[PDB]
Amino acid sequence: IEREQHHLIESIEKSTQYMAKRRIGALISVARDTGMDDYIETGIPLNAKISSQLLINIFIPNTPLHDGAVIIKGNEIASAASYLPLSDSPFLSKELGTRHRAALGISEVTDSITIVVSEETGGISLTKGGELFRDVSEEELHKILLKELVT
């Protein structure tokens, strides 16, 4: 499982870096100890092997799988186009869109790690436990994913 988490990290990193250069909006939520099955069930089931290639193809704009969140559970991309709870926090900047609000929302009610790619800026953001790491560098993203996902 140790190699699966590292492959998960590398897949997120490659897909997000690919989509960030192209300003392709993306929203990837990795479940952890708390189940996210209710929101998996809101999307289109994939139950697919994790890969950067599939993550990218899912988020291509105007495609059947892009409008929503990808939820990763265990060693599978469980679903795409899932809905996530939107945070009601007035602290979150109005310059950020609903992807960040969804990413903040799910982080308030689960211990899940959620990664966002802004289609406006290409900035990669991350949410965990109700907090937002906005516009992280590749180094910062790699350290956070290593810390939070390799357990």
Ligand X SMILES: Cc1cccc(NC(=O)CN(C)CC#N)n1
Indicate whether 84 belongs to the interface with ligand X (CB under 6 A): yes
Indicate whether 119 belongs to the interface with ligand X (CB under 6 A): no
10 labelled binding-site residue: no
Residue from 6, 7, 23, 83 that binds ligand X (CB under 6 A)?
A: 83
Helix/strand/coil for 54: helix
Indicate whether 86 belongs to the interface with ligand X (CB under 6 A): yes
Give the dihedral of Cα atoms 135, 20, 79, 51; nearest 10 deg: -120
Compute CA distances 102 → 44, 51, 57, whole Å.
17, 23, 21
Compute CA distances 37 → 29, 65, 75, whole Å.
12, 18, 14
Residue bearing tokens 């899940």: 112
Residue from 15, 39, 54, 126 that binds ligand X (CB under 6 A)?
A: 39
Scanning 51-59, 72-80, 84-92, 109-117 for contacts with ligand X by CB under 6 A, the matching segment is 84-92
Helix/strand/coil for 100: helix
Cα 69 to its chain centre, rounded Å, is 7
Residue from 28, 30, 50, 68 that binds ligand X (CB under 6 A)?
A: 68
Residue from 28, 36, 54, 69 that binds ligand X (CB under 6 A)?
A: 69
Indicate whether 26 belongs to the interface with ligand X (CB under 6 A): no
Query: Residues in the site for ligand X, rule: CB under 6 A?
Result: 27, 39, 42, 68-69, 83-86, 98, 102
Residues at the binding site are: 67, 84, 97-100, 118-120
